[model samples]
Target: FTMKYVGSIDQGTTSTRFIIFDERQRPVSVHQVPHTQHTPHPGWLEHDPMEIFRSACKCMSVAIAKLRQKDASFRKIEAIGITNQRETTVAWDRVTKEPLCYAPVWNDLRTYDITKKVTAELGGGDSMFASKITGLPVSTYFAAFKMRWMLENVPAVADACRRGTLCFGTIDTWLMYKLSGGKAFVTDVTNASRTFLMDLRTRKWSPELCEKLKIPMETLPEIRSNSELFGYVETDECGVAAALNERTPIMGSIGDQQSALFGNMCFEKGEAKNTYGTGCFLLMNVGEEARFSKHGLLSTVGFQVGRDGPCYYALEGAIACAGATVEWMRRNMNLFSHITECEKLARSVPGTQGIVFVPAFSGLLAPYWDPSARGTIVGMTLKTTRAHVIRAALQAIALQLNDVVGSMKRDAGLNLSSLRVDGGLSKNGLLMEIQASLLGVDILVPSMHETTALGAALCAGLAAGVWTSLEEVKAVSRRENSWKTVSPSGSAMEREAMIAEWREALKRTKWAK
Candidate 1:
């Protein structure tokens, strides 16, 4: 049997990994490396793009070596796929290939200055014309806003932009360039969508948006589809080139979230999935037509079969607390020292016990969309302690998303029947059970939790004809280790009673800064 497997480079915000998957989309060998992510000072978010590339190269090389050492035939890895952390902006010298500065992550607050100006330029607030065009508000959560911040603040980026020697892209483009030895300086539609530069309808860089934002359009990569042959690995350099031979074709690509949507098999409109991390990201596939949300969620182009294929649309929702809220409780409120203790402590109490926490410390997003909402704890009485408080915090995280899911369902006019989940927080049994109970949906945790990586591999496999059709892909992908399904098992009266207290907490939050 002549079998050619595919490889997906999952370069996330916190870590970089290379996973090799067979025709069944089963990862035969895996190698992962965590990258640097954090601050040098207060209010700063950053990642070194150079180190990221280095680590990505190392991971793929090791993983490939493992494959060749075992059952894998050399040169049998035919296609390469890439899915990376979306929205974060990186500007590099076009010739030197060195980043002008540490890439500003998506959550960086510094881009507020840029977005503030962006909103004013676009007629401000709900009247911003760009939102209608791009399916996103003028906010710091995009690559364009981060790019504008760098152009204005970083001398290297500004100088290079002036000289027409700057190349700006999200993490995907950065790795593609390095992987293909600088021959593939491009990004797919899904990753491009999050940059606020692409027109959702046309699936191209909006010339007007670029002109208005004062961003140099030439610095952007040529946009492609989620699956297409971009270029080949040159195999002349170190790192990724060192991993594969010159014949390996880099085929499929997409953003991390959109890739997960595909990997989870949400093929039809209104099919949805949710991921929990520092924030909860809930994305629903809205099919081909571009969707504009009237319900506070952002509707944008989801994914595509390829450059020539029909582009899918989706509605995106986010919640701002996951493990971080518990951290906030531990650090600010002296609730608990170790996060490991949170599960035990929270489970110590059967529930929040009527306590409700609105962890709006950094404000709300998605359905709520309130930046003014500060963190609030309600229903705490003389009987309350760390157990109830921690439990409340956990409960609050799930509830915020419960509200978003409901809102999203109404906006899309489709029932979110099941939810596919993967993230650091998803491992928490209590949180998953609570989320299952609250949403009343089957919780899907793929036997292996590498949804992002799995997504890239799926795209590559489809593109390379290792799998001829989506049905075939799904058939092979169906046989997995174990499917952990968490079903809702909560009393209606008890759940409804707690929900009443949650609404009261929401009523008090975002009331004042």
Candidate 2:
């Protein structure tokens, strides 16, 4: 039997990867490359658009070459799917097809002043004034705020806007445009939902919000579905097109968190997935209708399979630190030398011993909604060792997730069924156990942990006919992937005590002015 393959380009916050998967949903070849994280100033981050585009091309060429070496019979990838870091705004010249300035990352705090101004002035002291329309809050994380920041600060971006040549998009649209040699100016609904410019109910750009936010509607990309013929890879950068030896359609595009939600098979309303990457994003599938959140969680599009196909909605709670906290403990604080030691040291301690560490390095998101909240460690005694601090950090992550899940349950009006876990932090056994215990539910960890990439591949495959339907995709995943379950281990008393300490500790985190 001739094997059909699909490729997924996972453009993340710190790196980009291309993975090739066979018809049976098995990963056959892969390549990854990290890009520079430009922290120009305190509380600000930027990424060179050209650097990211080149890195993506480089990954594709390398992964394709390796696949050829392994399977000489491999002819070509059926389609290419793209899943990217959501809300990282990119500004480029429509005519020149080049970035006007370095893209501002999602977590960048340069828009803090603008966020507040919008909330006070435009929103009339209410951040959720437009939430009913856009399903987002007036915060630094959305794309329109980033775009507004560019127009106010960057002269070139402002010039392009005046000339009607400015193109603003998230990372996915930027990649697709460059990959198609400037032919495809499109973004998927999942990515568009994060822009604060798209109407959640209509799945279209909101002219009123764009006008109110001072973002030009002409600068936006056309909205499309997650699974469809977006465009073809037409560029030969790094010899990527030549390496393929055949035309490959760009079939899938989605935001990374939503991509993980789809990849984890959270098809029902109550199902959820939590991805523990640089930050932690916990998204629950809320079914077809959009559910406005009374809690601080953001409402977003889960996924749309095809053009006007079934579009699913989700309620998302974001944490600003997860693996980032671990890295800080190792690189910044000298808590542990290696990543493996993070778990070991944390597990060495039975409890935090009256200490609670709130690693809100970038402030708190979801339920708390305090962007001013800074990292704080309270109740520390001289008896608090590095072990206790590390353990406290782990517990903090779980505690934060528990709060987010509670908010989700309240907003969605449905109890979480189970949580599928992914990303770098999911491998920490201690963390997983703590999470399971606190939530009182089992955590499902896929042995084939490339579920994020698989999500994009599945989108492309479904569009390209490599798979017939969602049922088929789930069947293949079940047959090919093995899952390890982490069940609840902590008793009610321990859980209650931990949460009580966590709640008390949260009051001290609001340090930023």
| Residue ranges of candidate 2 with Cα displaced over 4 Å | 381-383
Candidate 2 structure quality by residue, lDDT tens digits, 10-118: 9999999999999999889999999999999998999999999999999999999999999999889999999999999999999999999999999899999999999
TM-scores for all candidates: the values are 0.93, 0.96
Per-model CA lDDT versus the true structure: 0.81, 0.92
Task: Please state the error at residue 333 of candidate 1 in Å.
Answer: 5.5
Candidate 1 per-residue C-alpha lDDT over 1-513 given as tens digits, one digit per residue, 9 for 90 to 100 = 766789998888788888998776678889989988778767778999988888887887889889888774557687989988888788898788778899888778888767766677565654346777788877778998888888888999899988888999999898888767666789888888888888888888998888988888889999998888988767444445656765788898888888888888777886787875545688999777876877788877677887678888899998865778877788888888887888999899877777788888877776877879888888778999989988888888788888888888887878887888887777788988998998888888887777778788888878888888778777766775356889998888867877888888887887663
- Name the Cα RMSD for model 2: 1.7
Name the 10 consecutive residues with the lowest summed lDDT in model 1: 234-243
Query: Which model scores highest in TM-score?
Result: 2
Model 1: clashing residue pairs? Answer: none
For candidate 1, give the lDDT: 0.81
lDDT of 1 at 147: 88
